[PDB]
Amino acid sequence: MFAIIETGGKQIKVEEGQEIFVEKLDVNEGDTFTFDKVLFVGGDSVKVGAPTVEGATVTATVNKQGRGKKITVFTYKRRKNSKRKKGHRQPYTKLTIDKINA
Amino acid sequence: MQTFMANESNIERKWYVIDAEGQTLGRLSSEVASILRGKNKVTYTPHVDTGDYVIVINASKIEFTGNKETDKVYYRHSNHPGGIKSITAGELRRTNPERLIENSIKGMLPSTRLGEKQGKKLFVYGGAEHPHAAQQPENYELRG
Amino acid sequence: PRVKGGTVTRARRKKTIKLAKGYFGSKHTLYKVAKQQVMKSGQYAFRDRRQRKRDFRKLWITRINAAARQHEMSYSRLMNGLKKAGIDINRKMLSEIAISDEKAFAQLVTKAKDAL
RNA sequence: ACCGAUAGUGAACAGUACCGUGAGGGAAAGGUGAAAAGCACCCCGGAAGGGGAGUGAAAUAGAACCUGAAACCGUGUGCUUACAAGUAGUCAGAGCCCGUUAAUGGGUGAUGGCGUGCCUUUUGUAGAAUGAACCGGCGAGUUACGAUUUGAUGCAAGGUU
RNA sequence: AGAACAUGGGUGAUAAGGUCCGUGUUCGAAAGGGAAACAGCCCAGACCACCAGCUAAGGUCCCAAAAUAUAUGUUAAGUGG
RNA sequence: GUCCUUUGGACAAUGGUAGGAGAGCGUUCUAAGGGCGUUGAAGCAUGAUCGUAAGGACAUGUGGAGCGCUUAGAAGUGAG
């Protein structure tokens, strides 16, 4: 019913049919991405992957490759005439789950 | 990813009974402070009040160790010049021991407005008798 | 030729005054005090983006420790047992499962426990 | 490849108002509309002022008349506030009210964490060391002629007036 | 115009958060964690994002994260003779 | 930066006051080329937009005659 996948440098709890936001993947819009590294399967029968579950794939369809909300990074030092200002937007990929395998 | 339970809002608080007979003041105090704080719930958030009610009833069989009774003076000032007052631990336990226990619970809680509220979930009684039977209170045993 | 110090000064000052919106009293209306508060808050945000990570890790650890004492075990001993079992699940993941499915968390506790 | 009303003459309307016994010093102050067609008449009012009506492309263009920022002063309203200790923000986060350059949307915010303004001068300043009531305008490495050293370009035993 | 610290010395009184040299470190010009708070002490050098993980110095009863952990000993004093 | 140089796979690097070096953003004016404007220019006000920064757009309301862009040039060229 729920699965744990390790993608990007992070771990995410997922369920059949929900939307997730991860660090950028090399994929185009429309395509189907499949995740390998599955760590936990929370179904009727529970599978624990201490390393991996050995099988255990999660399927998803890519939609909306995108770049995130912008943040201004600002720092200064008091009686010293130094300050720095710069902008950052972080990329992401948006996915919807369809399959949890085991 | 933000997959993270925080919204404790709509929690369920329960009611507990601990008895003071033959315990140490500080050790009972710290465990009770933890329960009032809510540190024992898998659902715990510091910005909303989880945690639940604790009833202490014997508050007269409190036990000190060493010479705490004659030492351990308590102090207070009235903001009036030379207005420092005092009382020693043993005679505070002998007259108004409920104050003795609840003071040392409340000194172990945060001093925010949420913390001073969490200290209001505490009821102390000298002697083994209390009025709170409609709340259906459960016995809790000090799991040291 | 002569330039006037014209419309550029207001535009630059008006950005800061808009960016100070919602502040208290003079803080959201006067340029010199608004500029100071808007540079002070930018230095707060850097520090606090670093601090979020450690704040949520502290909360996850305390919720797992609460979940561990329910099954008569300590947080430190539990994480050691999971390391020896090899389990790669995460502090945040370990809290989210311990909150949603206690029965999945109990099997993890038993495997973490007989790994020792 | 000079200024456009704090500029350019002190002076776009003045060696005047004003100040000084005198020699003398010395300002602030441009803009209705294409055309006065510059609001007949009724209503309130002692009047001022206003409300209609009228003229006009347009009277929040009516003489305090082009546009009309900010400080500062008000009227109304969505959310919030009378057990609370503070450089007033930031990060988290319920509840209520909304609907945009529709997008990982906007307003407000019970409650939790962290957190002693800026500039100058100093070995060292939250400093009980200096300066600033607030807002607007103005306010500080320039030019001429020489010298040295880099870059560029033309010609070269020549190169240049 | 330098400053504290540890070590080598003069001066002073085997005084000074004193003063003068020498050998290092750090502040100056350095944010982050610890020492309650605390330029100069201990750990460590911030290009930007993340609600990922391992560690340093310091720590694990509550405030306030993590052992009311083990096994084995001292202490009864609470924080010139 | 580095260098195999597939300029990408890496080997990296990237706190900072006096101060040295590099690359840019805006303002006024001129030349040349192309534009816009009473079917509404500049200015002013609001917005939930874009750019690594200085900054640039677009929509709407107010305003009622002027003003951008591209390449080059010249300065009374930026205030807390």
Domain coordinates in residue numbering, chain B = 1-144
Task: For residue C98, give the nearest of B4, B42, B46 by CB distance.
Answer: B42
Contacting subunits of B (3+ beta carbon pairs below 8 A): A, C
Do the Cβ atoms of B40 and B79 come closer than 8 Å? no
Number of domains in chain A: 1
Tell whether the torsion through CA atoms of C66, A37, A13 and A3 is positive or negative.
negative
Phi-psi region of A17 (alpha: psi -120 to 50; beta: other; left: phi over 0): left
Tally of CA atoms within 13 A in the half-sphere of B144 that contains its CB? 8
The three-state secondary structure class of A91 is strand
What is the three-state SS of C14-74?
HHHHHHCCCCCHHHHCCHHHHHHHHHHHHHHHHHHHHHHHHHHHHHHHHHHHHHHHHCCCC
Tell whether the torsion through CA atoms of A79, A80, A86 and A90 is positive or negative.
negative
Task: For residue B42, give the nearest of C56, C67, C92 by CB distance.
Answer: C67
Residue A69: CB partners within 8 Å, gap ≥ 6? A89
Where in chain B does DSSP place strands (E)? 15-18, 23-24, 53-58, 62-63, 73-77, 84-88, 122-126, 138-139
Tell whether the torsion through CA atoms of B40, B45, B46 and B51 is positive or negative.
negative
Do the Cβ atoms of A47 and C89 come closer than 8 Å? no
Task: Provide, as residue numbers in chain B, all residues whose Cβ is less than 8 Å from the Cβ of C98.
Answer: 42
What gap in Å lies between CA B16 and CA B124, rounded to an integer?
12
Do the Cβ atoms of A62 and A32 come closer than 8 Å? yes
What gap in Å lies between CA A93 and CA A20, rounded to an integer?
8
Task: Provide, as residue numbers in chain A, all residues whose Cβ is less than 8 Å from the Cβ of B3.
Answer: 12-13
Q: What is the structure's resolution, reported in angstroms to one decimal? A: 2.7
Helix orientation angle between C91-100 and C31-70, rounded to the nearest 10 degrees: 60
Chain C interface disruption, residue of B42, B52, B141, most C CBs within 10 A? B42
Do the Cβ atoms of B111 and B43 come closer than 8 Å? no
The gap between B6 CA and D92 C1' (Å) is 10
Residue C50: CB partners within 8 Å, gap ≥ 6? none
What gap in Å lies between CA B123 and CA B106, rounded to an integer?
12
Task: Provide, as residue numbers in chain A, all residues whose Cβ is less than 8 Å from the Cβ of C107.
Answer: 46, 48
- Chain-chain contact of B4 with C96 (C-beta, under 8 angstroms): yes
